[PDB]
Design a protein around this nucleic acid. Sequence first.
RNA 1: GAAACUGCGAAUGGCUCAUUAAAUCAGUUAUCGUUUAUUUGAUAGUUUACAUGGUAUAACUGUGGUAAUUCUAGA
Lengths: 258, 181, 221, 98, 130
Amino acid sequence: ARGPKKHLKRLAAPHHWLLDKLSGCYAPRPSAGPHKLRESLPLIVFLRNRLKYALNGREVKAILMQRHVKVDGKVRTDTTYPAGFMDVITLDATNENFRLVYDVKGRFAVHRITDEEASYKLGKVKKVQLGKKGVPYVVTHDGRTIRYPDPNIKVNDTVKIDLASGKITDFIKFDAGKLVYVTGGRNLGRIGTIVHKERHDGGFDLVHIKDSLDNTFVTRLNNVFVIGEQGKPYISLPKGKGIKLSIAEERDRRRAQQ
Amino acid sequence: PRAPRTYSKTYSTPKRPYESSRLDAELKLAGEFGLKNKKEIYRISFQLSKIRRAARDLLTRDEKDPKRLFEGNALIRRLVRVGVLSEDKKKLDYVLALKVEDFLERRLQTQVYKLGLAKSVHHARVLITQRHIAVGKQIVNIPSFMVRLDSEKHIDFAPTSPFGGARPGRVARRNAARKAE
Amino acid sequence: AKQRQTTKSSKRYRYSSFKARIDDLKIEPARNLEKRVHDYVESSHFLASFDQWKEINLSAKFTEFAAEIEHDVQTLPQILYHDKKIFNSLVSFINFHDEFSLQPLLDLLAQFCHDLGPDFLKFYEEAIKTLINLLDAAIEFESSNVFEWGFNCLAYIFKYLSKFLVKKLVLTCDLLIPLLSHSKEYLSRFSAEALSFLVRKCPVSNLREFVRSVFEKLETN
Amino acid sequence: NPADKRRRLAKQYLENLKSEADIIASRLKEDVAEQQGRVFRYFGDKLLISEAKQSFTRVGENNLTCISCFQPVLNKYTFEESSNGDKNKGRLFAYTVS
Amino acid sequence: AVTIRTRKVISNPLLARKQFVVDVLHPNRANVSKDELREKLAEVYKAEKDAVSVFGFRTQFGGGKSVGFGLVYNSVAEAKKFEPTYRLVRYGLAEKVEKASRQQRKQKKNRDKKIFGTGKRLAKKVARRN
RNA sequence: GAAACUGCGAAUGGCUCAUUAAAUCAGUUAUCGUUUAUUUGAUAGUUUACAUGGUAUAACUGUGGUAAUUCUAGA
Ligand SMILES: [Mg+2]
Ligand SMILES: [Mg+2]
Ligand SMILES: [Mg+2]
Ligand SMILES: [Mg+2]
Ligand SMILES: [Mg+2]
Ligand SMILES: [Mg+2]
Ligand SMILES: [Mg+2]
Ligand SMILES: [Mg+2]
Ligand SMILES: [Mg+2]
């Protein structure tokens, strides 16, 4: 190609969006934004294929141009705006606030939250560095740069960002015993507690995570997101609480509730 | 272009179509079940072979294997639901003991014959293809329709059928009109 | 400006300024001939509109208002017996000035007066005072729809209480003087239309008193 | 305006309840409870089975097969009794077959 | 008799409407045209007919029942604002815009691409030349 | 609101497999070895002003050339 691509085939789209393979030939290409293309949910999919509020792309555009959707407290009018992990989506006219959190299956789940919970979000500290004029700043996972961070904040820590003012309220250090959320790999969407962090200089660090059921799994550090201390998450969790459950029991409880 | 839509063949030609004993076997199956052609027999045989090969592969696995337990249980549930496998025989070994006749009886044609709605298997076929038979509240015109245990008690003449309480067909009212005239 | 949007474009969606909407807006409910929910009633106007608004509006304030008043509005006699608490709740929620919930509340307030007109007279002064505060509050936050809801509700109350208000229209005018004399041209303009309906309905004898009083007042905006 | 008419009927109906006496509020719910298809006559506990005055009246006809009873009822919508005629005001009838 | 049952009802104040799936039982009848379904739905939900849209109706094999999708806008103006133009034309609320076939418009576009400016100067130039 | 100037796009998409045998490509690395429109977040009291020019032109008015073109000359 002689330049950046602008089209996305449905088969090539991220699997977790759950798009019909025969509905059309192309899928919404997320525009540039806070989150990466493969780890983002465009607003069109959320409003049409998840909430079912709109029946087609044009109706989604009509909703957006009416300025009823807010992302992180800001109005967005792009159909393919890349909303992502820990993103707050507010619909005032319908009066709901949603937090984009993966389910156990590995898919963004429609999780409704209260207003007081919608007032803040969490961000994994991807980078800390001194800017121009000797002003420290922190870059989070969603591309937010916050100046004058607390000196104790380091990489791999989590910062509680208030949406209205965009300032850090609290933070969590990355240490053993902390509650973590998996954001990648086939363990995507699971929740557990840190046990040990294995370090390899010049390589990818590995973290051992133990679930509430005592099952243990190892994951690369890049896919780990600290969300609080054990038993005290700073955000409301989706149904299932990030516990992976086998297939036989899946049959079992589906029958039981049925 | 749009993504492909998958397709598959539902029947396979036999290893040796020319065995005299075989030819007599399809003669029996077609004659007793009123099958139009040999392709129906081959289709049922192919489905049965797939089922029993899966059962054999599951048996080869060690007992208590999660894959074995899950998949064998699913297969037994499906076979019980369609009715080929009786309730008291819920083990993978008896699945290997199934026969083509078991599936053939569950065909809507044969069931219609047994229930007494038709005087011949061919009469059952013509009744089904002419939209006179309804399972539950819905009309089925396909002789190859497989009946479930729950569906078995709901087979009846369709509401729209002249035999099911609707007005007489075209021939009857035509004859009545000419007689009146 | 001076060449107003006389020639409309082919665009289906067009931007309109608040002043543009206000200039085009006019307070006269009767000219609107669209089918109204309250026209068809089984128990009461209030109940007929109350169920409908539950279907359309999902605002938090309205939902809270509905739950408090749901049990006491099932029947017209129940509304009459519990009229005091119903009016207090309606006034309480309107004062919050939540635009998401104003439309169902303002409509129900008019329909409330429709059910028990002569009984609403004891509520009349508070109802008008609540609207005046709302319309004054509406100036701070731009929403033309809020003005349309408020004044139509005022117009509706006049229509249902047309007989009683006409007898003492000078009192009704006295309440609306801040609106009629308000600095904004449109707020005075809208109020004038609402009060105009009462005037055209007046007996000549009652009118002569009203015209004398206003001329006495005439002796800002 | 028919709403005024309902108000008049409601007003007269309200005056009746005041003669019948919280109490007014509950009784208001009860009268319309026929519209809402739910049980609204909770009187089982207060009932007195033991003191029931029982009687058996012999009849000539054989194998009395069914009985139908007619009860005039005040209608809340129009506040008039269901009696066919003025002579039948508050007269209870029972019909029997054999 | 004909019965209309509404299922999977959703309230979309974003678009200011109510969505649902309409199931229509019509024994002894071929089917129900969109007009009667619209007037019955309008009566049931107490709205103006112009505010009711219905489409996508399929009668199952064997007849006797149909399934489609139905929309009820909160008022007529919003229906005009959001409803697709073609559905408006179906209901007669809007008039079909008459336009030339795509090939004619494309050919005209190309011919106008060839000319530069208003083109009157070329007209007078060729008039004087000939 | 035609025309024209201005801004953006036209480097996406669609088609074909000619060349290509550690080349392409698959998996897996690196940029402490570099560019990056756009989106998103930060970020600039230190630079006649009740606001400067044609150092200028299109569209447009008008005069024309060529057999001919999405050609264009002078004013
Ligand atoms: Mg490194
Ligand atoms: Mg037929
Ligand atoms: Mg240009
Ligand atoms: Mg080649
Ligand atoms: Mg070579
Ligand atoms: Mg190599
Ligand atoms: Mg751009
Ligand atoms: Mg920027
Ligand atoms: Mg020049």
